[PDB]
Amino acid sequence: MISLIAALAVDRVIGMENAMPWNLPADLAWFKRNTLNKPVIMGRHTWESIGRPLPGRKNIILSSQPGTDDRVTWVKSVDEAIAACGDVPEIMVIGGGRVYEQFLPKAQKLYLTHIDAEVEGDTHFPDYEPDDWESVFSEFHDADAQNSHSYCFEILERR
Ligand SMILES: NC(=O)c1ccc[n+]([C@@H]2O[C@H](COP(=O)([O-])OP(=O)(O)OC[C@H]3O[C@@H](n4cnc5c(N)ncnc54)[C@H](OP(=O)(O)O)[C@@H]3O)[C@@H](O)[C@H]2O)c1
Ligand SMILES: Nc1nc(=O)c2nc(CNc3ccc(C(=O)N[C@@H](CCC(=O)O)C(=O)O)cc3)cnc2[nH]1
Ligand SMILES: [Mn+2]
Ligand SMILES: [Mn+2]
Ligand SMILES: [Mn+2]
Secondary structure, three states: OEEEEEEEOHHHEEEEOOEOOOOOHHHHHHHHHHHOOOEEEEEHHHHHHHOOOOOOOEEEEEOOOOOOOOOOEEEOOHHHHHHHOOOOOOEEEOOOHHHHHHHHHHOOEEEEEEEOOOOOOOEEOOOOOHHHEEEEEEEEEOOOOOOOOOEEEEEEEEO
């Protein structure tokens, strides 16, 4: 099973200048809980944005060019990325925009954080047809001293 996990600001913005400009510790904790002990697939730009391997996960990087770091697994196509995960229950696709586009048609589940923040951005999460997806979990949180925007965690499953 393939799942996508992402955090979206207003208008589905996910990034600006190869970065995420907000800081929401509660959402990073949610990301860690939902990805630990699973393979994670990311594109090369997202790998450069994170800047190090994510511990406790098999890190798989998509790039058309040879890898430059043997602490992670480098693959050259979507099918190779999936194969490199092996026989696991759930593969997590962690972006960025181009990678989410390619994996969305193959995904059964979306883990989305909706952040109440207006961000100039240059990267968006794909338009997804709402009729295709059922919301199975949602949890709203007001802003607090650690998290400067309100946010909603949602899990959607393909109908
Ligand atoms: N808010 C969030 O949840 C979230 C999550 C992830 C990322 N982001 C943000 O998203 C942005 C990065 O997204 P992006 O769309 O620019 O880049 P991306 O999807 O991370 O990376 C694209 C790169 O991945 C490689 N790639 C993708 N598909 C491939 C394929 N089928 N075969 C081979 N290589 C493939 C290519 O690398 P080569 O050029 O080396 O071939 C391509 O240039 C950053 O701003 C980041 O902070 C946000
Ligand atoms: N829900 C969600 N939120 C995000 O911010 C997010 N970000 C990415 C891409 N960027 C990043 C950037 C940093 C870390 C990261 O350092 N994660 C640590 C958390 C511990 C910490 O630094 O606070 C991890 O071990 O997972 C992960 C993804 C992909 N999916 C996401 N999904
Ligand atoms: Mn092929
Ligand atoms: Mn198999
Ligand atoms: Mn806000």
